[PDB]
Design an enzyme around this catalytic site. Structure first.
Site, PDB file in Angstrom:
ATOM      1  N   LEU A 312       1.581 -25.414   4.487  1.00  0.00           N
ATOM      2  CA  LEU A 312       2.902 -25.624   5.078  1.00  0.00           C
ATOM      3  C   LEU A 312       3.694 -24.330   5.209  1.00  0.00           C
ATOM      4  O   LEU A 312       4.440 -24.162   6.179  1.00  0.00           O
ATOM      5  CB  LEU A 312       3.698 -26.632   4.255  1.00  0.00           C
ATOM      6  CG  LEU A 312       3.419 -28.110   4.503  1.00  0.00           C
ATOM      7  CD1 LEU A 312       4.250 -28.929   3.556  1.00  0.00           C
ATOM      8  CD2 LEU A 312       3.735 -28.480   5.937  1.00  0.00           C
ATOM      9  N   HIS A 313       3.541 -23.403   4.267  1.00  0.00           N
ATOM     10  CA  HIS A 313       4.213 -22.113   4.368  1.00  0.00           C
ATOM     11  C   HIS A 313       3.442 -21.122   5.225  1.00  0.00           C
ATOM     12  O   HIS A 313       3.868 -19.970   5.350  1.00  0.00           O
ATOM     13  CB  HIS A 313       4.460 -21.500   2.986  1.00  0.00           C
ATOM     14  CG  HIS A 313       5.325 -22.326   2.086  1.00  0.00           C
ATOM     15  ND1 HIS A 313       6.667 -22.519   2.323  1.00  0.00           N
ATOM     16  CD2 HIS A 313       5.060 -22.946   0.913  1.00  0.00           C
ATOM     17  CE1 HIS A 313       7.182 -23.259   1.359  1.00  0.00           C
ATOM     18  NE2 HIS A 313       6.226 -23.535   0.492  1.00  0.00           N
ATOM     19  N   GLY A 314       2.311 -21.531   5.786  1.00  0.00           N
ATOM     20  CA  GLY A 314       1.469 -20.652   6.566  1.00  0.00           C
ATOM     21  C   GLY A 314       0.499 -19.941   5.652  1.00  0.00           C
ATOM     22  O   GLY A 314       0.882 -19.485   4.572  1.00  0.00           O
TER      23      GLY A 314
END
Ligand SMILES: [Zn+2]
Length: 423
Positions: A312-314
């Site tokens: 989700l944060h990359g």
């Protein structure tokens, strides 16, 4: 400093976000006019398009793509009882494709937050439809309004579909609301100023191992205040748009809390740090990833939850390494604190005990000493993990952590060793 760092930084932050705040307030005034639900959702869609265009220029197409794609998938499986599974799979695909560098790195990273919030909202609506919390599959305008809620589009906290619908229904504008927005905005600007001015220059003013730990700690504290800025700004935007309220005992409390800085800066446990870091995110990962991954066991579900958080944060290797280390650190601290609480009948759990708990030693000097030791260990872990976020691949992570002599991992190993032996 007065006109050298504080004012420039404050201008930098307040400048860009001003438009976003304006649209949140506009949405809030427009949603109290008694318009039809369709009009409210459509209006926030248009506002979300304008905010996404303002922050990401022409490159907002990726978020638009995801929004339409998620609705398309949800529609195709609108009768299936596994809507969350299909939406999570489609989010997995989209995120992986973006991490594969098909899109420009600068552009992709620029809007990781907005895309993260849109993905979290889509997966949450799918799982809420699966569990029956949402009765019927929403119309296209409601889903698009939920994804493009202008208070929760750019840096906004994830909110549930029911929370969004409550925001749509509207609440009277009160002094409590204005105080919440003002407090959140003031705290956001303060945290940004601290992150840019106070944070980086903490130890020199306010290359031995001590020097390295000082630099690591100040880089961690600066990263923390930057995150707190985003958290408080997200609280301000969401509250200013009309969401984030709790109708408790027929008494309205605007108490949406994204980050609790006091519980991280002065930490009792690393579990508390992770939870207080981003309450919406922690709740989302706990309810929509952790509960669905309990079939693999508790520890495997922790790894699945942290891997989903990393995606989700990359996928950057330093952040993935931080979250993978955080899974082991939090788990080991949690289990050790629990077993110590059991053996030593003390209130040394990762959270505060309730006033009616069976622990014999509640306020002794040893309990305070153990809590202080674990809090110092948590601050030590924060400096270690936050040293990676100075202002980045595998080599950088390895070298940077070797500069701190792998202290946290050895400490984590020692705590884990201690845990097994005492039991
Ligand atoms: Zn207790």
């Amino acid at each position: 400093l007065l006109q050298g760092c504080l004012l420039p930084t404050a201008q930098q932050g307040l400048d860009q976000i001003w438009l976003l705040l304006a649209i949140c307030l506009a949405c809030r005034l427009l949603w109290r006019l008694g318009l039809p639900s369709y009009l409210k959702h459509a209006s926030t869609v248009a506002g979300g398009f304008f905010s996404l265009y303002h922050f990401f220029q022409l490159h907002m197409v990726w978020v638009v793509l995801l929004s339409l794609l998620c609705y398309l998938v949800l529609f195709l499986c609108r009768h299936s009882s596994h809507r969350g599974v299909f939406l999570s799979v489609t989010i997995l695909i989209y995120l992986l494709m973006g991490e594969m560098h098909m899109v420009d790195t600068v552009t992709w990273h620029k809007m990781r937050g907005a895309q993260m919030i849109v993905a979290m909202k889509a997966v949450s609506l799918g799982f809420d439809l699966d569990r029956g919390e949402v009765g019927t599959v929403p119309s296209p305008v409601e889903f698009m309004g939920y994804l493009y809620f202008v208070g929760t589009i750019v840096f906004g906290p994830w909110i549930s579909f029911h929370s969004y619908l409550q925001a749509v229904q509207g609440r009277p504008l009160s002094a409590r609301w204005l105080q919440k927005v003002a407090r959140s905005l003031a705290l956001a600007l303060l945290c940004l100023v601290l992150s840019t001015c106070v944070g980086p220059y903490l130890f020199p003013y306010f290359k031995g191992t001590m020097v390295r730990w000082l630099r690591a700690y100040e880089s961690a504290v600066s990263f923390h205040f930057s995150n707190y800025f985003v958290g408080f700004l997200s609280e301000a935007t969401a509250t200013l748009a009309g969401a984030g309220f709790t109708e408790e005992k027929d008494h309205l409390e605007w108490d949406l809390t994204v980050s609790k800085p006091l519980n991280v800066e002065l930490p009792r446990s690393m579990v508390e740090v992770v939870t207080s870091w981003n309450l919406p995110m922690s709740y989302w990962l706990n309810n929509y990833v952790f509960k669905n991954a309990l079939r693999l066991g508790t520890f495997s579900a922790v790894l699945v939850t942290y891997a989903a958080s990393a995606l989700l944060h990359g996928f950057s290797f330093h952040l993935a390494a931080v979250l993978l280390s955080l899974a082991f650190i939090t788990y080991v601290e949690h289990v050790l604190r629990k077993r110590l609480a059991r053996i030593l009948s003390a209130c040394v759990l990762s959270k505060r005990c309730p006033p009616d708990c069976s622990h014999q030693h509640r306020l002794g000097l040893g309990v305070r000493a153990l809590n202080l030791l674990f809090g110092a260990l948590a601050i030590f872990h924060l400096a270690y993990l936050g040293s990676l976020f100075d202002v980045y691949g595998m080599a950088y992570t390895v070298h940077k952590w070797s500069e701190l002599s792998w202290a946290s991992h050895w400490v984590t190993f020692g705590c884990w060793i201690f845990y097994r032996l005492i039991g």
